[PDB]
Amino acid sequence: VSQNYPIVQ
Amino acid sequence: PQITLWKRPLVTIRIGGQLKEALLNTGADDTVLEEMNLPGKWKPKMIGGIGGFIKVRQYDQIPVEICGHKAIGTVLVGPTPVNIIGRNLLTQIGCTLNF
Amino acid sequence: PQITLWKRPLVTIRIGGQLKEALLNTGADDTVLEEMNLPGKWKPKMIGGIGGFIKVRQYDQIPVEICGHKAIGTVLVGPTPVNIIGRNLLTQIGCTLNF
């Protein structure tokens, strides 16, 4: 499964 | 080039001769863009992020142009906090992490 | 080193007398680790990405050792599906993107 971890506050 | 991480590595890309700013994400498997209009047919897909799974639209073989660099891969269009250029394309342009 | 991106840039770090795998994520602003025990006072915070938001605990000046180098900063600890080393610690170890 396609994993995409951008993170924003 | 060689971009530092003192600030979000946001560069510009011309997806299908159209300009939109996106983030270079070594933490993403694919390239995800916020509601955009690409032609051709598409397959719905499920991808996962920090919070769970979401439904995104899939387009195959779209010509992307990251900082004067030619790349042709799969772009996903769906709700995403920011536009993202994932490893799927970053590789095609010989991008690497060095420290 | 020179991490190529044809596969998740996972590396080994060392924090609180523990070895753990983390992801070199240039797409994250802070550093989020899976639930664990760190010493000191921490404050709440909501961080979000694709999929939603999760409440984390923020600890400051925590000494980390990314795949071989020193680096103390801010480590957020919460229900993250994977450990992530953000741009806050990546810069401290002089990390960059080159394509």
Coil, helix or strand at residue C72: strand
**Residues of chain B with C-beta less than 8 angstroms from the C-beta of A8:** 81-82
Which helix H or strand E contains B87, and what residues bound it? Answer: helix B87-90
Judged by a CB distance cut-off of 8 A, whether residue C99 touches chain B is yes
CATH T-level fold of B1-99: Cathepsin D, subunit A; domain 1 (2.40.70)
Q: What are phi and psi of B4, to 5 degrees?
A: -85, 160
Angle (CA) B4-B7-B10 rounded to 5° is 85
Task: Say if CB B61 and CB B80 are below 8 A apart.
Answer: no
Token representation of residue C54: 């999760």
What distance in Å separates the CA atoms of residue B9 and residue C96, rounded to the nearest whole number?
10
Asked if A2's CB is within 8 angstroms of B30's CB, the reply is: yes
Q: What are phi and psi of A7, to 5 degrees?
A: -130, 140
Q: Which residue's entry shows tokens 């599906």?
A: C81
Closest CA of chain C from B40, distance in Å: 25
